[PDB]
Amino acid sequence: GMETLELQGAKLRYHQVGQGPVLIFIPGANGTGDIFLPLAEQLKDHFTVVAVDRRDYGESELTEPLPDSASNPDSDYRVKRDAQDIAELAKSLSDEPVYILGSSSGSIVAMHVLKDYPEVVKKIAFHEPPINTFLPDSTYWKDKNDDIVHQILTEGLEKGMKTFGETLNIAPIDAKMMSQPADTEEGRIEQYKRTMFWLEFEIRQYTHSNITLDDFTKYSDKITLLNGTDSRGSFPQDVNFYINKETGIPIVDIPGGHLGYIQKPEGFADVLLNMWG
Amino acid sequence: GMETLELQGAKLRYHQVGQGPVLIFIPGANGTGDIFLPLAEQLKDHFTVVAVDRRDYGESELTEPLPDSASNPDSDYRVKRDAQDIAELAKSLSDEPVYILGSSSGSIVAMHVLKDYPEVVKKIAFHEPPINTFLPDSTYWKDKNDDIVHQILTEGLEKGMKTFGETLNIAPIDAKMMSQPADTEEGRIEQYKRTMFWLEFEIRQYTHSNITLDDFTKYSDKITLLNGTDSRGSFPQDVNFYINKETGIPIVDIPGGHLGYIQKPEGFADVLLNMWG
Ligand SMILES: *C(=O)N(NC(=O)OC)c1ccccc1
Ligand SMILES: *C(=O)N(NC(=O)OC)c1ccccc1
Ligand SMILES: [Mg+2]
Ligand SMILES: [Mg+2]
Ligand SMILES: [Mg+2]
Ligand SMILES: [Mg+2]
Numbered sequence: 376g377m378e379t380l381e382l383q384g385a386k387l388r389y390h391q392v393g394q395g396p397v398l399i400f401i402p403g404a405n406g407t408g409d410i411f412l413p414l415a416e417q418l419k420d421h422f423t424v425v426a427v428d429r430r431d432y433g434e435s436e437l438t439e440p441l442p443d444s445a446s447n448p449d450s451d452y453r454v455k456r457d458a459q460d461i462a463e464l465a466k467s468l469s470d471e472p473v474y475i476l477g478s479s480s481g482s483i484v485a486m487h488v489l490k491d492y493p494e495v496v497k498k499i500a501f502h503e504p505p506i507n508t509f510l511p512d513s514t515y516w517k518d519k520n521d522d523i524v525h526q527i528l529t530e531g532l533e534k535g536m537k538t539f540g541e542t543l544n545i546a547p548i549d550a551k552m553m554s555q556p557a558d559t560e561e562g563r564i565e566q567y568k569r570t571m572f573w574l575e576f577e578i579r580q581y582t583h584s585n586i587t588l589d590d591f592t593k594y595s596d597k598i599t600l601l602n603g604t605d606s607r608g609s610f611p612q613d614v615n616f617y618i619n620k621e622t623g624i625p626i627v628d629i630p631g632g633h634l635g636y637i638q639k640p641e642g643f644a645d646v647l648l649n650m651w652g
Numbered sequence: 653g654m655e656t657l658e659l660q661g662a663k664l665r666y667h668q669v670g671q672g673p674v675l676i677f678i679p680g681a682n683g684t685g686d687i688f689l690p691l692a693e694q695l696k697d698h699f700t701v702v703a704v705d706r707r708d709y710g711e712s713e714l715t716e717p718l719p720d721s722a723s724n725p726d727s728d729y730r731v732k733r734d735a736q737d738i739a740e741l742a743k744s745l746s747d748e749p750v751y752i753l754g755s756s757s758g759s760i761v762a763m764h765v766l767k768d769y770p771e772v773v774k775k776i777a778f779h780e781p782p783i784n785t786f787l788p789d790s791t792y793w794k795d796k797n798d799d800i801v802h803q804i805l806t807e808g809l810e811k812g813m814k815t816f817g818e819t820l821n822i823a824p825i826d827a828k829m830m831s832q833p834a835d836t837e838e839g840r841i842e843q844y845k846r847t848m849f850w851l852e853f854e855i856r857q858y859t860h861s862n863i864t865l866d867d868f869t870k871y872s873d874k875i876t877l878l879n880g881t882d883s884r885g886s887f888p889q890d891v892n893f894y895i896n897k898e899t900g901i902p903i904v905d906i907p908g909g910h911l912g913y914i915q916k917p918e919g920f921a922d923v924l925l926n927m928w929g
Contacts, residue, residue: 398928400913404830404846404847404850404854404855405846406846406850410911410913410914411913411914413914413917414913414914414917414920414921416917417917417918417920417921417922418921418924418925421925421929431849431853432846432849441853445853445857446852446853447857448856448857448860449856449857449860450857451857451861451862453853453854453857453858454857454858454861474928476878476924478910478911478913479888479910480850480854480855480858480859483858483859483861483863484858486863486867487861487863489867489871489874489875490863490867493870493871496871496874497874498874498875498876498927498928499874499875499876500875500876500877500878500904500924500927501875501876501877501878501892501895502878502880502906502912502913503878503879503880503883503886503888503889503891503892503910504877504888504891504892505820505859505887505888505891506858506859506860506861506863506891507859507860507891508859508860508861508862508863508864509863509864509865509894510891510894511894513860516859516887517856517859517860519819520855520856520859520860521856523812523815523816523819524812524851524852524855524856526808526812527808527809527811527812527851528851528852530808531803531804531807531808531809532804534804535800535801535803535804535808536804538800538803539800542796542800543782569681569682569683569709570681572708572709573681573683573757574801574804574805575723575801575805576708576718576722576723576730577681577730577757578681578757578797578801579725579794579797579798579801580722580724580725580726580727580728580730580731581730581731581757581760581761581783582757582760582782582783582784582785582793582794582797583725583726583783583784583785583790583794583797584728584731584760584764584783584785585728585785586760586763586764586767586783586785586786587785587786588786590763590766590767593770594766594770594773597766597770597773597774597775597776598766598775598776598777598778599775599776599777599778600777600778601753601777601778601779601780602780603779603780606780609780610782610793611756611780611781611782612780614780614781614782614783614784614787615778615780615781617786617787617788618778629779633755633756633780634687635779636677636687636688636690636691636755636779637687637688637690637691640690640691640693640694641694643691643694644691644694644695647695647753647777648695648698650775650777651675651751651775652698652699
């Protein structure tokens, strides 16, 4: 029941109420136009009020993924695309320049609409903008933003992964290898994305998934449990000891630790060939 | 030069090396089959080694978005879909049941292959599985996993946003509304996701984007700066004061704080109507 404008790479959804000249509201960090609906009610007698879900939020939908460069802190892709979305929206609703109000990061989008598409702007209002670029003390504010993001995204991840390693009693050879930063900068960023994905979407879901001891017993003739020789004392080995205790399925010891198939591939292969070759 | 199998909702990419019966390697948290290539080199005279990029990783690609529910810690969509991928891969490559080895969370995928598609399994190996569901101390391990994930996600964000609000001298009323938990577990998942997105993809990129005072002066007749009456002393108001000092563009005071358009919609509208009505 929201309105839709199909744009390059997204379906932009927006609320529309009232009659009269167009007044576009651009949301801040919440990203969604619903926050303006009580205000639009007060204005709907004077304006056609348009409250946008910016394309990354709410009921708007991307039709292709964000470019990889958007994670760079100096990327201008998103802010320019958001501004162009507003301009295209204005042109789709009005043959005349429109009224625009943005708040917070939405006021920065509004600044870029005026810069890149001044022809669509009749009047514009910047409500409490947090932009720092043109300030005399820009560096202080930029560094504070960079440091808070770094602390949240990087330090929090680093410390919780160390805790996860300690909780499972992972061996030093595996700990040292699982945390090795990738060589390239492309590999460092992908490694971060993969870790955050595994964290949110894999670890809890998979480790508490629906496997019972009875599932092992039905096909026990097919199964080998493998324990590394260099990862003794770790939690996964205790899982295999419990399966063995309750099912009788044999444990075969195999060279290396948790990552033994890449630490000691010759010896790992030798055991697999003894099993199955 | 990876191979591709096109499946429901994904293009599954894999390495294939060697000759002989099919041996599928399922990766753990790294998600990608390249970790098995040194091992494949040792096995390639005895097996057709197939080392998979699971569909959410590496050179595999989704062709449809994940379900929204996949972020739920109780979801089993992904592990079941991973297991179905391996079964379809086996049937595409072999008319006999195949050999399968999984490590870490890949061993859990392997367990679901055996459970749901035993007809594709000749022999299977579970290398160091971290599954806890059937353990006698399952609650301890499940609750640890949930606690570490929550700590890395949600909580590190909570602390950084408190520093952010102090650094910018955000009004308590605003910091209160901005930080209010949603009244649903799932609404809270969504709200954390939105903050995490804004942190990584918006705050740095937008607040240090390319806007100069010259961009304002060119169109000063069109611009109003808005300061809330309930957010005095905060950094966004200092930005407006600087713009006004240097350009003469007027500041209008408007009811509410940083979120005044929803806190005080009638008073906010009255000012906008005075400006533009
Ligand atoms: C704007 O809405 N926000 N940004 C800001 O004030 O300075 C960058 C914001 C709103 C809610 C949560 C976090 C930031
Ligand atoms: C498997 O590869 N991992 N899981 C595990 O041992 O218990 C859940 C893993 C690899 C790297 C980092 C964290 C976990
Ligand atoms: Mg200052
Ligand atoms: Mg031998
Ligand atoms: Mg708990
Ligand atoms: Mg909490």
